[PDB]
């Protein structure tokens, strides 16, 4: 209820889920850079179906053209900033994700990989960028995953959260993701949840540092399915709210969907529906996946543009869309 928003993908194709960046493989979506309407995409999602906020990923190796550290690369950055200034543009805030499953080529960060001042180095260049505009959104990391010691990962997490206000990003939130592809359904029971509830600000306050999580609606929870078969209310919404509620806290489900299909219709609803009842806990949700994926894309949001007049998928002008 305080923020709805979509996935524009593009800069994250070429990212594999170990933390490998085929960084000539990324993709931009907006026309320039010979791709989707990313800009167009997200007037309309502003102007004709309510939406809030988008989630704009990008994998480091993008940001620094191959380096695990700090370093922007200004070529690439001009891309993903004209991204970035688009959402702003459309009048909306912005998540600003790097999408690389806490890894970097094979290697965990913090455990392995870089170290967490390699990755804090990041942060603090990406908040002096933007620090001061606070429709910003700060999205520590994608999809952590398969990592050993999460006391560890809050750790590097909280090396992220300093470097950022130390780049003066004072007022933003700054979202915490933990283990198990940041699944709702685990996220207290793996141990992610009172790990980083010990992440603080520099003056010892938890203030705008959210909690992130994904949950797909389809068996596996891989959000590869075009069939959903369930809500994750009884398995998911419900227990972390619970948990959420008594410990103060909020979260906000940076990645949901389902396939443009009837079984989809019902239960992202219901979802939905969910999450906005619970609107105390939960501050919003953002649907993956518009941006250029390709017409079929399974969990493909992606409208249309005939001259002016944008068509939206199924399961948008149905659930997602906050109108109605």
């Known amino acids: 209820l305080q923020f709805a928003g979509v996935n524009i993908a593009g800069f994250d194709f070429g990212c594999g889920s170990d933390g490998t960046c085929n960084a000539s493989g990324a ?44 370093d922007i690369d200004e070529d690439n950055w001009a891309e993903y900033d004209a991204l970035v200034q688009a959402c702003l543009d459309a009048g909306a805030s912005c998540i600003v994700d790097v999408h690389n499953y806490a890894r970097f080529n094979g290697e965990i960060i913090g455990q392995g990989g870089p170290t967490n001042q390699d990755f804090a180095a990041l942060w603090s260049s990406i908040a002096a960028k933007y620090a001061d505009n606070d429709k910003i959104i700060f999205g520590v990391m994608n999809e952590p995953h398969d990592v050993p010691d999460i006391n560890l990962w809050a750790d590097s997490v909280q ?46 306050s938890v203030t705008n540092l959210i909690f992130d999580v994904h949950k797909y609606l389809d068996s596996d929870n891989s959000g590869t399915h075009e069939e959903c078969t369930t809500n994750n209310i009884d398995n998911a919404w419900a227990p972390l709210a619970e948990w959420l509620r008594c410990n103060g806290r909020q979260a906000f489900n940076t990645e949901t969907g389902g396939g443009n299909v009837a079984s989809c219709e019902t239960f992202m609803c219901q979802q939905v529906a969910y999450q906005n009842a619970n609107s105390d806990v939960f501050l919003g949700y953002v649907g993956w996946a518009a941006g250029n994926f390709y017409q079929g894309y399974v969990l493909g949001e992606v409208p249309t543009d005939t001259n002016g007049v944008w068509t939206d998928t199924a399961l948008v002008s149905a659930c997602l869309a906050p109108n109605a």
Do not use: C
């Open 27 to 70: 993709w931009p979506p907006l026309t320039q850079y010979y791709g989707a309407d990313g800009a167009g995409q997200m007037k309309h999602f502003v102007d004709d179906d309510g939406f809030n906020v988008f989630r704009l990923p990008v994998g480091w190796q993008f940001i620094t053209d191959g380096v695990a550290g700090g």
């Open 159 to 204: 090396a992220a959260v300093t470097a950022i206000r130390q780049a003066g990003a004072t007022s933003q939130i700054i979202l915490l993701p933990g283990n198990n592809w940041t699944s709702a359904e685990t996220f207290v029971s793996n141990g992610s949840a009172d790990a980083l509830k010990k992440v603080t600000n520099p003056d010892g």
